[PDB]
Ligand binder design. Structure first.
Ligand SMILES: CCCCCCCCCCCCCCCCCC(=O)OC[C@H](COP(=O)([O-])OCC(O)COP(=O)([O-])OC[C@@H](COC(=O)CCCCCCCCCCCCCCCCC)OC(=O)CCCCCCCCCCCCCCCCC)OC(=O)CCCCCCCCCCCCCCCCC
Ligand SMILES: CCCCCCCCCCCCCCCCC[C@@H](O)O[C@H](CO[C@H](O)CCCCCCCCCCCCCCC)COP(=O)(O)OCC[N+](C)(C)C
Lengths: 122, 175
Protein backbone atom coordinates (compact mmCIF):
# COMPACT_ATOMS: atom_id res chain seq x y z
CA UNK A 1 0.00 0.00 0.00
CA UNK A 2 1.39 3.40 -0.96
CA UNK A 3 0.22 6.31 1.18
CA UNK A 4 1.84 9.22 -0.68
CA UNK A 5 2.51 7.86 -4.17
CA UNK A 6 -0.49 9.58 -5.69
CA UNK A 7 -1.21 12.75 -3.80
CA UNK A 8 -2.64 15.47 -6.02
CA UNK A 9 -0.14 18.05 -7.26
CA UNK A 10 2.86 15.77 -6.80
CA UNK A 11 5.60 16.22 -9.42
CA UNK A 12 7.12 12.85 -10.42
CA UNK A 13 10.88 13.25 -9.90
CA UNK A 14 11.23 16.58 -8.09
CA UNK A 15 12.82 15.54 -4.74
CA UNK A 16 12.00 19.01 -3.37
CA UNK A 17 8.70 20.77 -4.18
CA UNK A 18 8.49 24.55 -4.09
CA UNK A 19 6.14 24.21 -1.11
CA UNK A 20 9.09 22.90 0.91
CA UNK A 21 10.73 26.35 0.75
CA UNK A 22 8.20 27.57 3.34
CA UNK A 23 9.79 25.40 6.06
CA UNK A 24 12.80 26.39 8.19
CA UNK A 25 15.95 24.74 6.83
CA UNK A 26 17.97 22.47 9.13
CA UNK A 27 20.71 24.29 11.01
CA UNK A 28 24.24 23.60 9.85
CA UNK A 29 25.03 22.42 13.40
CA UNK A 30 22.16 19.91 13.34
CA UNK A 31 23.33 16.79 15.22
CA UNK A 32 22.06 14.61 12.37
CA UNK A 33 24.36 16.48 9.97
CA UNK A 34 27.22 16.01 12.44
CA UNK A 35 26.48 12.28 12.48
CA UNK A 36 26.59 12.23 8.67
CA UNK A 37 29.98 13.94 8.83
CA UNK A 38 31.07 11.30 11.33
CA UNK A 39 29.97 8.65 8.83
CA UNK A 40 32.09 10.30 6.14
CA UNK A 41 35.09 10.44 8.46
CA UNK A 42 34.63 6.75 9.27
CA UNK A 43 34.49 5.99 5.54
CA UNK A 44 37.77 7.86 5.08
CA UNK A 45 39.42 5.94 7.93
CA UNK A 46 38.21 2.60 6.53
CA UNK A 47 39.48 3.64 3.09
CA UNK A 48 42.90 4.30 4.63
CA UNK A 49 42.92 0.99 6.51
CA UNK A 50 41.82 -1.16 3.55
CA UNK A 51 44.52 0.29 1.28
CA UNK A 52 47.24 -0.43 3.91
CA UNK A 53 47.96 3.26 4.52
CA UNK A 54 48.51 5.04 7.85
CA UNK A 55 44.91 5.17 9.03
CA UNK A 56 44.79 8.63 10.58
CA UNK A 57 47.38 10.55 8.55
CA UNK A 58 47.44 9.09 5.02
CA UNK A 59 45.19 11.32 2.96
CA UNK A 60 43.80 14.52 4.42
CA UNK A 61 42.32 15.71 1.12
CA UNK A 62 40.50 12.38 0.68
CA UNK A 63 39.17 12.46 4.25
CA UNK A 64 38.02 16.06 3.80
CA UNK A 65 36.24 15.13 0.57
CA UNK A 66 34.55 12.19 2.31
CA UNK A 67 33.27 14.33 5.19
CA UNK A 68 32.16 17.11 2.85
CA UNK A 69 30.29 14.75 0.52
CA UNK A 70 28.45 13.04 3.37
CA UNK A 71 27.45 16.40 4.88
CA UNK A 72 26.36 17.73 1.48
CA UNK A 73 24.08 14.77 0.79
CA UNK A 74 22.78 14.70 4.36
CA UNK A 75 21.63 18.32 4.24
CA UNK A 76 19.25 17.71 1.33
CA UNK A 77 18.22 14.35 2.77
CA UNK A 78 17.18 16.07 6.01
CA UNK A 79 15.32 18.79 4.11
CA UNK A 80 13.29 16.19 2.20
CA UNK A 81 12.57 14.15 5.34
CA UNK A 82 11.31 17.21 7.22
CA UNK A 83 9.16 18.18 4.23
CA UNK A 84 7.56 14.73 4.15
CA UNK A 85 6.74 14.84 7.87
CA UNK A 86 5.26 18.34 7.50
CA UNK A 87 3.11 17.06 4.63
CA UNK A 88 1.90 14.14 6.75
CA UNK A 89 0.90 16.42 9.63
CA UNK A 90 -0.81 18.90 7.29
CA UNK A 91 -2.89 16.16 5.66
CA UNK A 92 -3.77 14.64 9.05
CA UNK A 93 -5.01 17.94 10.45
CA UNK A 94 -6.96 18.82 7.30
CA UNK A 95 -8.69 15.43 7.29
CA UNK A 96 -9.60 15.68 10.98
CA UNK A 97 -10.98 19.18 10.40
CA UNK A 98 -13.04 18.07 7.38
CA UNK A 99 -14.59 14.98 9.05
CA UNK A 100 -15.89 16.18 12.44
CA UNK A 101 -18.23 13.20 12.88
CA UNK A 102 -15.36 10.69 12.99
CA UNK A 103 -13.39 12.63 15.65
CA UNK A 104 -15.80 13.65 18.42
CA UNK A 105 -14.64 15.51 21.52
CA UNK A 106 -16.68 13.87 24.27
CA UNK A 107 -17.29 15.25 27.75
CA UNK A 108 -14.38 15.35 30.17
CA UNK A 109 -14.77 13.39 33.41
CA UNK A 110 -12.73 14.07 36.53
CA UNK A 111 -11.22 11.22 38.52
CA UNK A 112 -13.65 11.94 41.36
CA UNK A 113 -16.52 10.65 39.19
CA UNK A 114 -14.82 7.76 37.34
CA UNK A 115 -15.16 4.40 39.10
CA UNK A 116 -11.88 2.49 38.87
CA UNK A 117 -11.60 -1.00 40.30
CA UNK A 118 -8.98 -1.43 43.02
CA UNK A 119 -6.83 -4.56 42.94
CA UNK A 120 -5.05 -5.15 46.27
CA UNK A 121 -1.49 -6.47 46.21
CA UNK A 122 -1.22 -9.04 49.00
CA UNK B 1 16.16 20.73 76.36
CA UNK B 2 14.41 23.26 74.10
CA UNK B 3 15.63 21.43 70.98
CA UNK B 4 12.25 19.73 70.54
CA UNK B 5 8.66 20.67 71.33
CA UNK B 6 7.60 19.07 74.61
CA UNK B 7 3.98 18.82 73.45
CA UNK B 8 4.78 16.54 70.50
CA UNK B 9 7.06 14.46 72.78
CA UNK B 10 5.56 14.72 76.28
CA UNK B 11 6.97 13.29 79.49
CA UNK B 12 5.65 12.92 83.06
CA UNK B 13 6.76 15.44 85.72
CA UNK B 14 9.77 13.29 86.77
CA UNK B 15 9.37 12.70 90.50
CA UNK B 16 12.57 11.39 92.09
CA UNK B 17 13.06 10.57 95.79
CA UNK B 18 15.55 12.27 98.09
CA UNK B 19 18.44 10.22 99.52
CA UNK B 20 17.83 8.84 103.02
CA UNK B 21 21.08 7.36 104.39
CA UNK B 22 20.51 4.74 107.09
CA UNK B 23 24.09 3.48 107.58
CA UNK B 24 27.22 4.87 109.19
CA UNK B 25 29.18 3.58 106.20
CA UNK B 26 29.98 5.96 103.32
CA UNK B 27 28.26 5.57 99.97
CA UNK B 28 30.82 4.58 97.30
CA UNK B 29 28.42 5.63 94.53
CA UNK B 30 28.42 9.24 95.75
CA UNK B 31 32.23 9.34 95.95
CA UNK B 32 32.55 7.84 92.46
CA UNK B 33 29.96 10.32 91.15
CA UNK B 34 31.89 13.26 92.61
CA UNK B 35 35.09 11.95 91.02
CA UNK B 36 33.40 11.45 87.64
CA UNK B 37 31.90 14.93 87.82
CA UNK B 38 35.13 16.73 88.67
CA UNK B 39 37.23 14.65 86.25
CA UNK B 40 34.97 14.29 83.17
CA UNK B 41 31.97 16.62 83.26
CA UNK B 42 33.92 19.85 83.84
CA UNK B 43 36.53 19.60 81.02
CA UNK B 44 33.76 18.56 78.62
CA UNK B 45 31.70 21.54 79.77
CA UNK B 46 34.65 23.88 79.19
CA UNK B 47 35.20 22.47 75.69
CA UNK B 48 31.50 22.90 74.93
CA UNK B 49 31.61 26.48 76.22
CA UNK B 50 34.55 27.25 73.93
CA UNK B 51 32.81 25.64 70.95
CA UNK B 52 29.59 27.56 71.60
CA UNK B 53 31.57 30.79 71.98
CA UNK B 54 33.08 30.17 68.55
CA UNK B 55 29.64 29.31 67.15
CA UNK B 56 28.03 32.51 68.43
CA UNK B 57 30.48 34.58 66.35
CA UNK B 58 29.10 32.98 63.16
CA UNK B 59 25.31 32.70 63.20
CA UNK B 60 23.20 31.90 60.16
CA UNK B 61 19.75 30.46 59.63
CA UNK B 62 18.16 27.81 57.45
CA UNK B 63 14.43 27.83 56.76
CA UNK B 64 11.86 25.05 56.69
CA UNK B 65 10.51 24.90 53.15
CA UNK B 66 6.85 25.77 52.66
CA UNK B 67 4.62 24.11 50.05
CA UNK B 68 1.28 25.39 48.80
CA UNK B 69 -1.75 23.16 48.33
CA UNK B 70 -2.60 22.22 44.73
CA UNK B 71 -5.69 20.44 43.32
CA UNK B 72 -6.02 16.82 44.38
CA UNK B 73 -6.36 13.79 42.11
CA UNK B 74 -10.15 14.09 42.34
CA UNK B 75 -10.21 17.50 40.63
CA UNK B 76 -8.18 16.29 37.62
CA UNK B 77 -9.47 15.28 34.21
CA UNK B 78 -8.86 11.74 33.00
CA UNK B 79 -5.93 12.43 30.66
CA UNK B 80 -4.71 15.80 32.00
CA UNK B 81 -1.02 15.03 32.50
CA UNK B 82 0.12 18.23 34.27
CA UNK B 83 -2.59 18.34 36.92
CA UNK B 84 -2.08 14.61 37.47
CA UNK B 85 1.66 15.19 37.97
CA UNK B 86 1.11 17.93 40.56
CA UNK B 87 -1.53 15.87 42.38
CA UNK B 88 0.74 12.81 42.45
CA UNK B 89 3.64 14.83 43.87
CA UNK B 90 1.41 16.30 46.58
CA UNK B 91 0.03 12.86 47.43
CA UNK B 92 3.56 11.45 47.76
CA UNK B 93 4.52 14.28 50.12
CA UNK B 94 1.43 13.60 52.23
CA UNK B 95 2.33 9.89 52.32
CA UNK B 96 5.78 10.77 53.68
CA UNK B 97 4.23 13.07 56.29
CA UNK B 98 1.83 10.34 57.43
CA UNK B 99 4.74 7.92 57.78
CA UNK B 100 6.50 10.46 59.99
CA UNK B 101 3.34 10.89 62.11
CA UNK B 102 3.24 7.13 62.69
CA UNK B 103 6.95 7.29 63.56
CA UNK B 104 6.32 9.96 66.20
CA UNK B 105 3.53 7.89 67.76
CA UNK B 106 5.71 4.77 67.83
CA UNK B 107 8.52 6.72 69.50
CA UNK B 108 6.06 7.85 72.18
CA UNK B 109 4.98 4.24 72.73
CA UNK B 110 8.54 2.91 73.06
CA UNK B 111 9.55 5.69 75.44
CA UNK B 112 6.50 4.98 77.61
CA UNK B 113 7.26 1.26 77.77
CA UNK B 114 10.84 1.90 78.86
CA UNK B 115 9.93 4.68 81.30
CA UNK B 116 7.13 2.94 83.20
CA UNK B 117 9.22 -0.11 84.10
CA UNK B 118 7.27 -2.93 85.74
CA UNK B 119 3.96 -1.01 85.49
CA UNK B 120 4.02 -0.57 81.71
CA UNK B 121 0.95 -2.71 81.01
CA UNK B 122 -1.27 -0.29 82.96
CA UNK B 123 0.65 3.00 82.73
CA UNK B 124 0.93 3.04 78.91
CA UNK B 125 -2.71 2.48 77.96
CA UNK B 126 -3.14 5.91 76.36
CA UNK B 127 -0.09 5.62 74.09
CA UNK B 128 -1.19 2.13 73.04
CA UNK B 129 -4.67 3.47 72.26
CA UNK B 130 -3.22 6.32 70.19
CA UNK B 131 -0.99 3.91 68.29
CA UNK B 132 -3.93 1.58 67.63
CA UNK B 133 -5.99 4.47 66.24
CA UNK B 134 -3.20 5.87 64.06
CA UNK B 135 -2.24 2.39 62.85
CA UNK B 136 -5.84 1.67 61.86
CA UNK B 137 -6.10 4.95 59.95
CA UNK B 138 -2.74 4.53 58.22
CA UNK B 139 -3.53 0.94 57.30
CA UNK B 140 -6.81 1.92 55.67
CA UNK B 141 -5.15 4.66 53.64
CA UNK B 142 -2.07 2.92 52.28
CA UNK B 143 -2.00 -0.83 52.91
CA UNK B 144 -2.26 -3.24 49.94
CA UNK B 145 -1.47 -0.59 47.33
CA UNK B 146 1.76 -2.48 46.70
CA UNK B 147 4.73 -1.46 44.64
CA UNK B 148 3.87 0.97 41.83
CA UNK B 149 1.41 2.75 44.11
CA UNK B 150 -0.13 6.05 43.04
CA UNK B 151 -2.83 8.53 44.00
CA UNK B 152 -5.26 6.92 41.54
CA UNK B 153 -4.99 3.53 43.25
CA UNK B 154 -5.49 5.13 46.67
CA UNK B 155 -8.58 6.88 45.31
CA UNK B 156 -9.90 3.59 43.92
CA UNK B 157 -9.36 1.94 47.31
CA UNK B 158 -11.19 4.76 49.09
CA UNK B 159 -14.09 4.60 46.63
CA UNK B 160 -14.40 0.84 47.14
CA UNK B 161 -14.41 1.28 50.92
CA UNK B 162 -17.05 4.03 50.70
CA UNK B 163 -19.23 1.85 48.46
CA UNK B 164 -19.01 -1.07 50.88
CA UNK B 165 -19.80 1.17 53.86
CA UNK B 166 -22.77 2.75 52.07
CA UNK B 167 -24.20 -0.67 51.17
CA UNK B 168 -23.71 -1.94 54.73
CA UNK B 169 -25.36 1.18 56.17
CA UNK B 170 -28.35 0.95 53.82
CA UNK B 171 -28.85 -2.75 54.57
CA UNK B 172 -28.63 -2.10 58.32
CA UNK B 173 -31.17 0.71 57.91
CA UNK B 174 -33.63 -1.77 56.39
CA UNK B 175 -33.32 -3.89 59.55
C1 LIG C 1 28.44 4.39 19.88
C2 LIG C 1 29.16 5.72 20.14
C3 LIG C 1 30.17 6.06 19.04
C4 LIG C 1 30.91 4.82 18.51
C5 LIG C 1 30.98 4.81 16.97
C6 LIG C 1 31.24 3.40 16.39
C7 LIG C 1 32.62 2.84 16.82
C8 LIG C 1 33.77 3.75 16.39
C9 LIG C 1 33.75 4.07 14.88
C10 LIG C 1 33.99 2.82 14.01
C11 LIG C 1 34.75 3.15 12.72
C12 LIG C 1 35.93 4.12 13.01
C13 LIG C 1 37.30 3.51 12.62
C14 LIG C 1 37.26 2.86 11.21
C15 LIG C 1 38.67 2.47 10.75
C16 LIG C 1 39.29 1.42 11.68
C17 LIG C 1 39.92 0.26 10.90
C18 LIG C 1 41.27 -0.16 11.53
O1 LIG C 1 41.82 -1.15 11.17
O2 LIG C 1 41.83 0.63 12.56
C19 LIG C 1 43.21 0.37 12.79
C20 LIG C 1 43.92 1.67 13.15
C21 LIG C 1 45.36 1.34 13.53
O3 LIG C 1 46.14 1.31 12.34
P1 LIG C 1 47.51 2.26 12.28
O4 LIG C 1 47.43 3.34 13.35
O5 LIG C 1 47.63 2.91 10.92
O6 LIG C 1 48.85 1.28 12.56
C22 LIG C 1 48.63 0.04 13.22
C23 LIG C 1 48.51 -1.09 12.13
O7 LIG C 1 47.55 -0.70 11.19
C24 LIG C 1 48.09 -2.46 12.72
O8 LIG C 1 46.87 -2.85 12.11
P2 LIG C 1 46.67 -4.44 11.70
O9 LIG C 1 45.73 -4.54 10.53
O10 LIG C 1 48.00 -5.03 11.31
O11 LIG C 1 46.06 -5.29 12.98
C25 LIG C 1 45.18 -6.38 12.72
C26 LIG C 1 43.84 -6.08 13.37
C27 LIG C 1 43.17 -4.90 12.64
O12 LIG C 1 41.78 -5.06 12.75
C28 LIG C 1 41.09 -3.89 13.22
O13 LIG C 1 41.70 -2.91 13.46
C29 LIG C 1 39.57 -3.93 13.43
C30 LIG C 1 38.89 -2.61 13.06
C31 LIG C 1 37.55 -2.83 12.35
C32 LIG C 1 36.75 -1.51 12.20
C33 LIG C 1 35.28 -1.64 12.68
C34 LIG C 1 34.33 -2.09 11.55
C35 LIG C 1 33.50 -0.94 10.96
C36 LIG C 1 32.86 -0.06 12.04
C37 LIG C 1 31.68 -0.76 12.74
C38 LIG C 1 31.70 -0.56 14.27
C39 LIG C 1 30.36 -1.03 14.95
C40 LIG C 1 30.14 -0.37 16.34
C41 LIG C 1 28.78 -0.80 16.98
C42 LIG C 1 28.93 -1.88 18.08
C43 LIG C 1 29.33 -3.25 17.52
C44 LIG C 1 30.78 -3.62 17.86
C45 LIG C 1 31.52 -4.21 16.66
O14 LIG C 1 43.01 -7.20 13.29
C46 LIG C 1 43.01 -8.01 14.46
O15 LIG C 1 43.86 -7.88 15.27
C47 LIG C 1 41.88 -9.07 14.69
C48 LIG C 1 41.23 -8.93 16.06
C49 LIG C 1 39.83 -9.52 16.11
C50 LIG C 1 38.85 -8.66 16.92
C51 LIG C 1 37.47 -8.52 16.22
C52 LIG C 1 36.74 -7.20 16.56
C53 LIG C 1 36.71 -6.22 15.35
C54 LIG C 1 35.45 -5.32 15.34
C55 LIG C 1 35.49 -4.22 16.43
C56 LIG C 1 34.84 -2.89 15.97
C57 LIG C 1 34.62 -1.89 17.14
C58 LIG C 1 34.47 -0.42 16.67
C59 LIG C 1 35.78 0.15 16.09
C60 LIG C 1 37.01 -0.16 16.99
C61 LIG C 1 38.18 0.81 16.73
C62 LIG C 1 38.98 0.43 15.47
C63 LIG C 1 40.20 1.34 15.28
O16 LIG C 1 43.26 2.29 14.23
C64 LIG C 1 43.49 3.69 14.36
O17 LIG C 1 44.56 4.10 14.66
C65 LIG C 1 42.34 4.68 14.10
C66 LIG C 1 41.36 4.75 15.28
C67 LIG C 1 41.32 6.15 15.90
C68 LIG C 1 40.71 7.18 14.94
C69 LIG C 1 39.78 8.17 15.66
C70 LIG C 1 40.58 9.29 16.38
C71 LIG C 1 40.01 10.69 16.07
C72 LIG C 1 41.06 11.81 16.28
C73 LIG C 1 41.37 12.06 17.77
C74 LIG C 1 40.67 13.31 18.32
C75 LIG C 1 39.17 13.09 18.64
C76 LIG C 1 38.31 14.34 18.34
C77 LIG C 1 37.49 14.78 19.56
C78 LIG C 1 36.86 16.17 19.37
C79 LIG C 1 37.10 17.08 20.57
C80 LIG C 1 38.40 17.87 20.46
C81 LIG C 1 39.50 17.31 21.37
C1 LIG D 1 22.12 1.18 3.98
C2 LIG D 1 21.94 2.71 3.73
C3 LIG D 1 21.00 3.00 2.52
C4 LIG D 1 21.64 4.02 1.52
C5 LIG D 1 20.96 3.99 0.11
C6 LIG D 1 21.79 4.81 -0.95
C7 LIG D 1 22.24 6.21 -0.39
C8 LIG D 1 22.96 7.08 -1.47
C9 LIG D 1 22.12 7.19 -2.80
C10 LIG D 1 21.86 8.67 -3.22
C11 LIG D 1 20.39 8.89 -3.73
C12 LIG D 1 20.32 9.89 -4.94
C13 LIG D 1 18.86 10.17 -5.41
C14 LIG D 1 18.48 11.68 -5.29
C15 LIG D 1 18.72 12.47 -6.63
C16 LIG D 1 17.38 13.02 -7.24
C17 LIG D 1 16.33 11.87 -7.51
C18 LIG D 1 14.94 12.20 -6.91
O1 LIG D 1 14.24 12.99 -7.79
O2 LIG D 1 14.23 10.99 -6.68
C19 LIG D 1 13.03 11.15 -5.95
C20 LIG D 1 12.91 10.04 -4.89
O3 LIG D 1 13.75 10.36 -3.78
C21 LIG D 1 14.55 9.28 -3.36
O4 LIG D 1 13.75 8.17 -3.13
C22 LIG D 1 15.29 9.64 -2.05
C23 LIG D 1 16.59 8.78 -1.87
C24 LIG D 1 17.16 8.85 -0.42
C25 LIG D 1 17.33 7.42 0.19
C26 LIG D 1 17.89 7.45 1.65
C27 LIG D 1 16.85 6.91 2.70
C28 LIG D 1 17.39 5.65 3.48
C29 LIG D 1 16.54 5.35 4.78
C30 LIG D 1 17.24 5.86 6.10
C31 LIG D 1 18.70 5.29 6.26
C32 LIG D 1 19.77 6.43 6.47
C33 LIG D 1 20.46 6.86 5.12
C34 LIG D 1 21.82 7.61 5.34
C35 LIG D 1 22.54 7.88 3.99
C36 LIG D 1 24.05 8.17 4.17
C37 LIG D 1 11.84 11.04 -6.91
O5 LIG D 1 10.67 10.79 -6.14
P1 LIG D 1 9.46 9.84 -6.80
O6 LIG D 1 9.71 9.63 -8.28
O7 LIG D 1 8.12 10.52 -6.62
O8 LIG D 1 9.43 8.35 -6.05
C38 LIG D 1 9.45 7.18 -6.87
C39 LIG D 1 9.10 5.95 -5.97
N1 LIG D 1 7.65 5.96 -5.58
C40 LIG D 1 6.69 6.81 -6.33
C41 LIG D 1 7.17 4.58 -5.71
C42 LIG D 1 7.60 6.41 -4.16
Amino acid sequence: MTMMSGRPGRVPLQFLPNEARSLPPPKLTDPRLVYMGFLGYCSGLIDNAIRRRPVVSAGLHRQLLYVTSFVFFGYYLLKRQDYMYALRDHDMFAYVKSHPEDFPEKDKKTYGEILEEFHPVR
Amino acid sequence: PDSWDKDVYPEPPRRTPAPAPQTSLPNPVTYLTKIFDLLVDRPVTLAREFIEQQHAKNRYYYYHREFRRVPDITECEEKDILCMFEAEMQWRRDYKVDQEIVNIIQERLKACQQREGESYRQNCAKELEQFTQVSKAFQDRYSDLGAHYSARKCLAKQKQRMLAERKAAKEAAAA
